[PDB]
Structure 1
Amino acid sequence: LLKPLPADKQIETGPFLEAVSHLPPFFDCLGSPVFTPIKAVISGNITKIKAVYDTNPAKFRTLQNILEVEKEMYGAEWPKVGATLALMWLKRGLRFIQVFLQSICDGERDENHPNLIRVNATKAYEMALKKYHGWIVQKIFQAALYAAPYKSDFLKALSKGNVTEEECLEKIRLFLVNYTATIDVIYEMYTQMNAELNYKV
């Protein structure tokens, strides 16, 4: 999965990229081609970070190094540049997933619609993405929501082949431990480096 955090909280770029490279395929298990463009955008972020990393894996050994090195490389253009920008967006997608999954695991629901996950996706959107989206992108989110899988198929997909919903949620809870810790460190690094931007798309 995601390997745990070292004591010094430095996140190794290579292993992080191998971990997150498992993410784009998981989109196809939301069970709708509607999500293909979102898959492609997240893949694009990962590809951009990988392209920078590959130029000098020692110089870009950790995610912290990416921000440090690029700040120096790009001056006034930073942080709206390079792998710093790609990771700024990637982390927002990762945080959306974190909040979404955590919300489902925490029993958050619409009483009247137990085999949907609309309410969980809406909370994740508000906490991770909405701040950076203008009116048009928000309308697109609303449209995409109609394509969201049934809770059961979604859980069946995350386990595909037969486990109970309860067993699946326990597996998701276990995954969430290192996943949340890793995302938290990435957000902290953007904050501490003043690398976070607040422009809307």
Structure 2
Amino acid sequence: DFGIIVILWKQVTVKEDGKVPLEPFLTAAKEVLRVVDAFGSGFRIVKNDIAGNIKKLYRANQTVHAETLQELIIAENSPDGLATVALLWLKRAFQFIASFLRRLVVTDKSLEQCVTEAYNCTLRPCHSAVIQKVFWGGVKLAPSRERFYRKLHPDLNIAKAKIEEFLIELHDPLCCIVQFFFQRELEDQCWGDEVYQRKDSSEWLK
């Protein structure tokens, strides 16, 4: 039931105030692991990374009881806060996953060049040289575009249709966080996928 990812991210409603709901965002964040599960063990860094992040956000949020991501980060007011460093990395991961899945659903480039350009414009600068080698090691274990699609949903056309709707819904909450971490001067390395990150949420398809 991969399509559930579309519905949960839609629940991450960013209205005019530009705030991201904390619980709808985190439930939906957990369903993104469906992506590293279809990629396989070579995505361990991304899988464990996101996971430790979804968990740490819950752990951090407590006495603060922030309702949205914005309020939670404001309460810590510190680049080294547990929740803030965690969301910086979680966002970077979805920019990567977003930058990746797009290069897969619209362009005709291989999955390999896909993981490369995606990584190259997001997390690569954030990884020490030794960790970059672990990631490239993991890309050696990558499926082809078709096996990737079929591990998400038995029917290729649906899996593809459903990643497309997902990317549409992940867009504003993720981009709200991206632009927000800069307002707080917390992002100095990861720029992400400029196209996907352009204001419109369906533009990147054309």
- CA shift for structure 1 position 94: 0.9
Tell me how far 1:198 sits from its aligned partner.
4.3
- Greater shift, 131-140 or 185-194, is seen at 131-140
Provide structure 1 residue ranges, at least 5 long, that are not aligned to the other structure.
Answer: 72-77, 111-116
- Paired residue for 1:81? 81
Q: Which residue of 2 aligns with 1:101?
A: 101
Counterpart CA distance in 2 for 1:85 and 1:24 is 20
Q: Which residue of 2 aligns with 1:70?
A: 76
Q: What runs of 5+ residues in structure 2 fail to find an aligned partner?
A: 1-7, 191-206
Q: TM-score, normalised by structure 2?
A: 0.80
State the SS of the aligned residue for 1:156.
helix
2:147 aligns with 153
Identity of aligned residues (%): 28
Answer whether contact 2:50 2:93 (CA < 8 A) is retained: yes
Counterpart of 2:46 in structure 1 is: 38
* Residue 191 (structure 1) aligned with residue 182 (structure 2): yes
What's the CA shift for 1:33? 3.1
Q: Deviation per CA, 1:7-58: give whole Å up to 9, x if none.
A: 212101111111112223442222x33434532221101111111123332x
Q: How many Å separate the matches in 2 of 1:101 and 1:26?
A: 9
Distance, in Å, in 1 between the alignment partners of 2:113 and 2:58 is: 34
Q: What is residue 197 of structure 2 aligned with on the other side?
A: none
2-side partners of 1:167 and 1:128: how far apart? 27
* Pair 171,22 (structure 1): closer, same or farther in 2 beyond 3 Å: closer
CA distance in 2, matches of 1:123, 1:69: 35
Q: Write out per-residue CA displacement over residues 144-169 of structure 1, whole angstroms, 9 at most, x where no aligned residue.
A: 11111121111011113xx2x34432
Q: What letter matches 2:93 in structure 1? A: G
Structure 1 position 168 matched with structure 2 position 159: yes
Which residue of the partner structure matches residue 181 of structure 1? 172
In the alignment, the residues of structure 2 paired with residue 19 and residue 127 of structure 1 have an alpha-carbon distance, to the nearest angstrom, of 24
Q: 1:172 to 1:61 in 2, by over 3 A?
A: same
- Cα gap change, 1:174/1:156 in structure 2, threshold over 3 Å: closer, same or farther? same
Amino acid at match of 1:129: L
Q: State the distance in 2 between where 1:166 and 1:104 align.
A: 13
CA distance in 2: counterparts of 1:104 and 1:121, whole angstroms: 9
Question: How many residues end up aligned between the 2 structures?
Answer: 181
- C-alpha contact (below 8 Å) 1:100/1:120 kept by paired residues: yes
Match among 8, 14, 20 for residue 5 of structure 1: 14
Whether 1:133 aligns to 2:142 is: no
Structure showing greater Rg: 1
Provide TM-score, normalisation by structure 1: 0.82
